[PDB]
Structure 1
Amino acid sequence: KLESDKTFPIMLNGQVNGYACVVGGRVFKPLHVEGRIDNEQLAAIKLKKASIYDLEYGDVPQCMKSDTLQYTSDKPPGFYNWHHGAVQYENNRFTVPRGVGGKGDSGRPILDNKGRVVAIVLGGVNEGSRTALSVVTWNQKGVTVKDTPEGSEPW
């Protein structure tokens, strides 16, 4: 809950529509969402494009390299902290309770107990009494992979 500062919002026509998060000395931001990151030093960098993950990624400049999250692909199923609450990971799917999150929560990191990011949320679909999150994770080998439950709608 306390590390959530390092995600900062983007401003689109003056309103927040998403968030850009810094991990591994690399700032990320969903492609689908437009705006300018709400701070100056990270506003400057030309953000390179990765369509196949829907993620613009850029090399955070020098003087706050040591001020970034860490991440691992080690993701046992269970409860994982996240801005609005807990997200339960099971059957290779991240799902949050119904109705929490939505428009504007894209780019929100999902952390584990030890503050390490496990995924960045990009969308959702509401199934039954839960809502499954379309995210960008790293697989057992640890290469980046977009995970989308069927019918996920971008946020």
Structure 2
Amino acid sequence: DKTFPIMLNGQVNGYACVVGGRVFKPLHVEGRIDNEQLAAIKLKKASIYDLEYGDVPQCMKSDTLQYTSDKPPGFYNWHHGAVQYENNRFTVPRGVGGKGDSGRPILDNKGRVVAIVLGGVNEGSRTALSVVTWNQKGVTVKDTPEGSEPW
């Protein structure tokens, strides 16, 4: 599932995709869809998340993985790359601009996708962040790094 950007007046506001059907439609900020051809359809909302539900087409079958919540501190890739921290969010360093970076998923090294960003950049030299993922029971964990930098 390609990181279809959301062209917010020429931006890439959400470089979103569909992890097996349900698309990472972020009602978070904005953006003219990249796959507007595919994205000609409408979507749900997400109050707890400012997002939307894709439920991609049958033609759009075989979209992306939806790795489970099983995760230690491990380097899950992103546009900024990978980072490995679990208790605190992934051990990225301070120096990546989360604003705009919203839409980066947890590209765990096992081909695993289990999470995607929500904000909360950094105070120390490291950068743990806010995310959205599956919870301990696999619930739709909406991770909120306290004092979150927008996106």
Please report the TM-score for the alignment, with normalisation by the length of structure 1.
0.87
| In the alignment, structure 1 residue 114 sits paired with structure 2 residue 89 | no
Question: What per-residue deviation string (whole Å, max 9, x for no partner) do you get for residues 43-83 of structure 1?
Answer: 21211001112221121112121132332111122322223
| Equivalent-residue separation in structure 2 for 1:117 and 1:61 (angstroms) | 20
Contact 1:125/1:153, CA 8 A, preserved across alignment:
yes
Query: Could you tell me which of 92, 96, 113 is aligned with 1:96?
Result: 92
The more displaced of 131-140 and 12-21 is: 12-21
**Other-structure match for 1:16:** 12
**Other-structure match for 1:133:** 129
Contact 2:79/2:101, CA 8 A, preserved across alignment:
no
Structure 1 residues 25 and 133 mapped into 2: Cα distance closer, same or farther (>3 Å)? same
Higher relative contact order (CA 8 A, sep 6+): 1
Q: Percent identity?
A: 100
Structure 1 residues 102 and 92 mapped into 2: Cα distance closer, same or farther (>3 Å)? closer
Number of residue-to-residue matches in the alignment = 151
Contact 2:120/2:129, CA 8 A, preserved across alignment:
yes
Contact 2:105/2:116, CA 8 A, preserved across alignment:
yes
| Equivalent-residue separation in structure 1 for 2:95 and 2:5 (angstroms) | 21
Structure 1 residues 31 and 40 mapped into 2: Cα distance closer, same or farther (>3 Å)? closer
Paired residue secondary structure (2:12):
strand
Contact 2:75/2:90, CA 8 A, preserved across alignment:
no
Structure 1 residues 52 and 16 mapped into 2: Cα distance closer, same or farther (>3 Å)? same
* Alpha-carbon shift at residue 92 of structure 1 (Å): 4.5
**Other-structure match for 1:40:** 36
* Alpha-carbon shift at residue 132 of structure 1 (Å): 1.8
* Alpha-carbon shift at residue 90 of structure 1 (Å): 2.8
| Equivalent-residue separation in structure 2 for 1:133 and 1:95 (angstroms) | 9
The more displaced of 104-113 and 70-79 is: 70-79
Query: Could you tell me which of 56, 79, 85 is aligned with 2:81?
Result: 85
Contact 2:91/2:126, CA 8 A, preserved across alignment:
yes
| Equivalent-residue separation in structure 2 for 1:88 and 1:101 (angstroms) | 18
Query: Which structure has greater strand proportion?
Result: 1
The more displaced of 95-104 and 117-126 is: 95-104
Contact 2:13/2:100, CA 8 A, preserved across alignment:
yes
Structure 1 residues 92 and 120 mapped into 2: Cα distance closer, same or farther (>3 Å)? same
Paired residue secondary structure (1:43):
helix
Please report the TM-score for the alignment, with normalisation by the length of structure 2.
0.89
Structure 1 residues 126 and 92 mapped into 2: Cα distance closer, same or farther (>3 Å)? closer
